[PDB]
Ligand binder design. Structure first.
Ligand SMILES: CC(=O)N1CCC(c2nc3ccccc3nc2OC2CN(c3ccc4ccccc4n3)C2)CC1
Ligand SMILES: CC(=O)N1CCC(c2nc3ccccc3nc2OC2CN(c3ccc4ccccc4n3)C2)CC1
Ligand SMILES: CC(=O)N1CCC(c2nc3ccccc3nc2OC2CN(c3ccc4ccccc4n3)C2)CC1
Ligand SMILES: [Zn+2]
Ligand SMILES: [Zn+2]
Ligand SMILES: [Zn+2]
Ligand SMILES: [Zn+2]
Ligand SMILES: [Zn+2]
Ligand SMILES: [Zn+2]
Lengths: 305, 305, 305
């Protein structure tokens, strides 16, 4: 039961979740029931679970509670347009993974933490933050009245945990390049097969990347506005890097503000476009992300003068 | 028992409440006792009521807790200089209405909510936020140990509720233009009469507008500083409008920052000056607001170069 | 048990405490044990005490919780390099004083409070905020399970309170000029004597100044970044001054932003350099602060073009 405008435009890939946090949870529950079903989860146990997650997000310009819901909607959009491809376990499992994918994020990349010699970097040699994101998740599920998979069998429960584990880790962009490249080949040869679990995890992996980056697939005015939040995080990290006696890459250097239009251009070309390209090849219904992406690419070129 | 400088300068229309929240409540209690009386309200029940209201204001650049107290002081200033015109019910009733007049405000106008298709817009077809502001008020009064009108008769209680209702709704600027225009005529013909309840509500209505806008009646340095908070709210709304695929009016368009000195000029001419003009006509003691207002008008013209 | 990079670089004067609050407490406990000893304080009672102090710091751009820890580290650095000069009482006493030295600070100088006619200004005729900082301290100690000097004798306890009292008051910069000038003479004549308690308090006094200002002794990139937080506080105060119908000194005037490179130059020359100069004269191990200070002085001159 969502407002008419929302019920209608929530099915759109480029949908924005507005500036109404209090309404954010509701928007999520709605999507679970439309994609998975009403009796997938007990309402109260779910709502309790949601509030807890909202609470374990930090007020960081970009990787915050809004990012979490936004990413999830893209997944919902992907799920609804490929409705016959996945089980409920995967559906109910993937939506949850998206909301938790950046839990307890502080706004610093894995690079900085290793430089800073942070306790977590010692704890997780690779994919430091993402491993923490999943750690946070399990802690929340282990809370009383928080196990929404209570009704699941221990077999099913373990399965959905793996799904969520694999998914969350995939939000490490460093892992993306190897994943896309592999998928690019397998698609070409025809060896690519969704019934292969090893193959299947990789698609899911690429699906997660598409969502984590979906701000490039929004309309131009949203994409441009979201951009401010992201560099806010980058430049701040650059500052802390500088506090370590370390010259940061120009991307995190606030002195190089002008360069940003080209910095984005390069990123689209090298990362974003190849990503949604590959995805539409495998999942044609996901093209609107790609089209919207290129529309934004054209805008960036239009910025340079 | 307020500091000497405060006790002295609190009687000034252009008084500013400083940056000491913790001291804000105290400043309010003081005004209730000077305008209405000590035994108007039970201290503890009042303080409890105040903290609750402070809690239900949001950290929004302008329409926040500070706005609430500031608006109330102007009313106090109006009440003290027209001391023989109103009953205690109206006095105690109007001060309370001013503090609650923007309860749970989020920083977006009624226009945006209707565009966004917000639940409240469906709930309140007209004067969406203001109806909510009064709804919030009643909820707080209905809290235990929060009914400061407990000592009032059910007749008096209902009366003061109407006063507060009517008052709060009047803070809708859309309603102002019709109200001023009517008052402008009645004053001219002489038909205007304070003993007429229909007439009486309209004055109260115009009094509320004067307070909600009183930042134009502060000294120039305060008026200029307060201005930043307001456009912060506007431009943000423009951003969200843009997120709806809707080109917002230049006032909410942050791209048109330069234009602001003229934007303010137009507003003074068309809205602010006619407002305090009419008010002084009816209530001559309220002229300092008008004088201070024009002093700020002269400053805006002085800005354009 | 701190990360390797931290264990190593925490002994450096120009050490920065990073952007990990959750890790800030730990960094403090570590320093107490390295400077004073493990059985100086009961762990739990200490941790309880720390969290309470963190809670009574305000989110003010500069004089906040980070400032508190940063100042304390400098003291630790001073203590560790002059290990044979002080008793444990003084050590355990001074580290604590540094963390509490700006408790409940709101970001306004004593000048503004007197102008504003604030309740505290009436309460404390001189060194208004600093007297409050110590008042806050005592209140926290008087909390249950918060008396970390519980194990101390009432004689020792009173002694450490005086130490803390004297120390905190010394963070009033107005008092500094008279203190340095006296120390400058006594050092010259040879009359300066650490066994003299009157003399001894003055050194401690100058040590506190060195720490409160230690942002000038950090590396250039940190010093420059910290600078933003400080003027944020100044300009805001200027704004409130203007709200009092009072033209503030150019330092708190945000209109005079350009002037800042020279404003800092003057400060170094007149205040910072003479301070660390005198300190190294008395305590040669504290020279790195001075060297780092001048390195930053050279940078400011390099700014002017
Ligand atoms: C973990 C990893 O590999 N990362 C690299 C890419 C980066 C990134 N993520 C984005 C997510 C959403 C939308 C845009 C994103 N853009 C990213 O980096 C591109 C934007 N960039 C640059 C590059 C060079 C620049 C030089 C000067 C000024 C700005 C620059 N911006 C690169 C995130 C970290
Ligand atoms: C609800 C309603 O009718 N509103 C119209 C007036 C508006 C408003 N409120 C003020 C309250 C206190 C002080 C000043 C206020 N100014 C307001 O709007 C005026 C300021 N404005 C403009 C107008 C056009 C502009 C064009 C370009 C750049 C800035 C502009 N500012 C109009 C509030 C919403
Ligand atoms: C209490 C007292 O005596 N104060 C004077 C010095 C001031 C101060 N504290 C600092 C602490 C750490 C680092 C730098 C600090 N700088 C301070 O003031 C200097 C910086 N200044 C100026 C002076 C004049 C200016 C004129 C135009 C623009 C900027 C200016 N900045 C002076 C603090 C208040
Ligand atoms: Zn992430
Ligand atoms: Zn993410
Ligand atoms: Zn309002
Ligand atoms: Zn208002
Ligand atoms: Zn201080
Ligand atoms: Zn300080």
């Amino acid at each position: 039961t969502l407002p008419v405008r929302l019920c209608k435009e929530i099915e759109l890939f480029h949908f924005d979740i507005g500036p109404f946090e209090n309404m954010w949870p509701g928007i999520f529950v709605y999507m679970v029931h439309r994609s998975c079903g009403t009796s997938c989860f007990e309402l109260e146990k779910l709502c309790r679970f949601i509030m807890s997650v909202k609470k374990n997000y930090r007020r960081v310009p970009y990787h915050n509670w809004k990012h979490a819901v936004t990413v999830a909607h893209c997944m919902y959009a992907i799920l609804q347009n490929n409705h016959t491809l996945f089980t409920d376990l995967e559906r109910k499992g993937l939506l949850i993974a998206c909301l938790c994918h950046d839990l307890d994020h502080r706004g610093f990349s894995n690079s900085y933490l290793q430089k800073f010699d942070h306790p977590l970097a010692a704890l997780y040699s690779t994919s430091t933050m993402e491993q923490h994101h999943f750690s946070q998740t399990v802690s929340i599920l282990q809370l009383e009245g928080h196990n929404i998979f209570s009704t699941l069998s221990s077999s099913e429960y373990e399965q959905v945990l793996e799904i969520i584990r694999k998914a969350i880790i995939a939000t490490d962009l460093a892992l993306y390049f190897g994943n896309r490249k592999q998928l690019e080949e397998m698609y070409q040869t025809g060896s690519l097969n969704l019934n292969n679990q090893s193959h299947r995890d990789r698609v899911i992996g690429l699906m997660m990347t598409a969502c984590d980056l979906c701000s490039v697939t929004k309309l131009w005015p949203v994409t441009k506005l979201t951009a401010n939040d992201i560099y806010a995080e980058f430049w701040a990290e650059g500052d802390e890097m500088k506090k370590l006696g370390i010259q940061p890459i120009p991307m995190m250097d606030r002195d190089k503000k002008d360069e940003v239009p080209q910095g984005q251009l390069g990123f689209y070309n090298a990362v974003a476009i190849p990503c949604y390209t590959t995805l539409t090849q495998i999942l044609p219904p996901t093209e609107p992300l790609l089209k919207a992406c290129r529309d934004n690419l054209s805008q960036w070129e239009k910025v340079i003068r």
